[PDB]
């Protein structure tokens, strides 16, 4: 029984829908169980890698704080020495960051590095099985597993991922460009894709906020 998914939002008529193979982790050979549709405006955006480059620099540099300090001659009881704690925090426009995330999804999908799954549930909690399954499906050395919400993530998957350094388990809200690039292949649950699509699709028709979103 194929699992058939369609985009909840209205796809443009001039753009055909994007499709990918749905997979399951229940068994080693449960590679294909359904077919899912992906919004072209999210999964078929233009390949603008400079935005991804810009986002990565912001991600690394917005948390940067330098605490180096030295005493100058006047402060002795250095001609050009470090002067107190300095921070490099800055904010990129959130539309660009949303745009950058959209581009990243296309790259992984077009490169056959993104693996759409119905659920993360695993028959066993052994970390070996997760590594074993990745080898059978020719997944990359680093695999990222994403679930809809942190609270409901299965215990078996957590145990397998917790013991694996190169296989990291993150919630949907924790997804970021850097991890996707760092991890060779991405594993996304079907609910996570819909959750990501809603926020990314919601970015359109962005009424400038007259008051804080809260």
């Amino acid at each position: 029984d194929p699992v058939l998914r369609k985009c909840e939002l209205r796809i443009p008529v001039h753009r055909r829908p994007v499709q990918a193979w749905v997979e399951s982790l229940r068994g080693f050979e449960q590679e294909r169980i359904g077919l899912a549709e992906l919004h072209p405006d999210v999964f078929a955006t233009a390949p603008r890698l400079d935005i991804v480059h810009q986002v990565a620099i912001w991600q690394r540099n917005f948390r940067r704080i330098s605490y180096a300090n030295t005493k100058t001659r006047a402060e002795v009881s250095v001609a050009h020495g470090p002067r107190g704690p300095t921070s490099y925090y800055y904010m990129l426009p959130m539309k660009v960051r949303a745009l950058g995330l959209k581009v990243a999804l296309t790259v992984k999908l077009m490169q056959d590095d993104l693996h759409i799954v119905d659920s993360l549930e695993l028959p066993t909690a052994d970390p070996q099985y997760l590594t074993e399954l990745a080898q059978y499906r020719h997944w990359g050395s680093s695999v990222l597993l994403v679930d809809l919400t942190h609270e409901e993530m299965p215990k078996n998957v957590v145990a397998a991922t917790s013991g694996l350094n190169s296989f990291n388990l993150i919630p949907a809200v924790g997804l970021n460009v850097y991890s996707m690039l760092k991890h060779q292949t991405l594993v996304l649950t079907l609910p996570s894709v819909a959750f990501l699509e809603d926020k990314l699709l919601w970015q359109d028709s962005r009424y400038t906020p007259l008051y804080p979103f809260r």
Binding site: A44, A46, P47, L49, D50, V52, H53, Q54, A56, I57, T106, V107, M110, Q111, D112, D113, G140, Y178, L181, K182, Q184, Y207, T208, L210, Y211
Partner: protein, 249 residues
Amino acid sequence: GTSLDLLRSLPRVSLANLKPSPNSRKRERRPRDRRRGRKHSFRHQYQPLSLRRLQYLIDLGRVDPTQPIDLTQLVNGRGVTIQPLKRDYGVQLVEEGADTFQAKINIEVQLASELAIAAIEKNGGVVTTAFYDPRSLEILCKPIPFFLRGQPIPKRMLPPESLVPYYTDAKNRGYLADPAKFPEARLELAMKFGYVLPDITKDELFRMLSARKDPRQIFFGLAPGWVVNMADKKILKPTDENLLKYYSS
């Protein structure tokens, strides 16, 4: 899009592959070497709205035609930008679109142009002017914050004596205008253009279009001195007699 066919063939991207866009970063000069070695308030700031924009708003369905035009709804529709820090004191109308804006609807604007009033009335629309205190108007634009503060609805203020003649003027169609002159005034405006005056009473929705709040009343829906149960999505009305005396005061 043949570019996608290039992407599929190309190898997987990595973190190191990232490269800044051409001309994104300019060069800089460093001192390491010889290269850098050696060496009006009183006047209300009325904010206008184009009828062509009004037609654009109406034509695009940005504002519901059935609902009477409300300044708060325009703010909700992002029609105009009002900044309290700018100390905006008024809102006005524009004669633009006089020949390309054929529509009829009820509206209220702090200031209205004499020429524009007749044109919309010629179509059958209803136009009036009300005075909102600049501090009160700011509350009107953003009702939710003062609910968060817990403040109750205050009575709407009245214009200073300088602006009383304008609002009291019948031709200006202000809420302080004498209603008795309106039937005569509307005919005079109709006579000026010469168009056949369409009686508002004939309209099926006449009562809805002609509905107007009390001068003390900030909101059509809500009377002054009221409170809102925002948490329970309900409206709370004071039951204290002294509070009624306070509102009368």
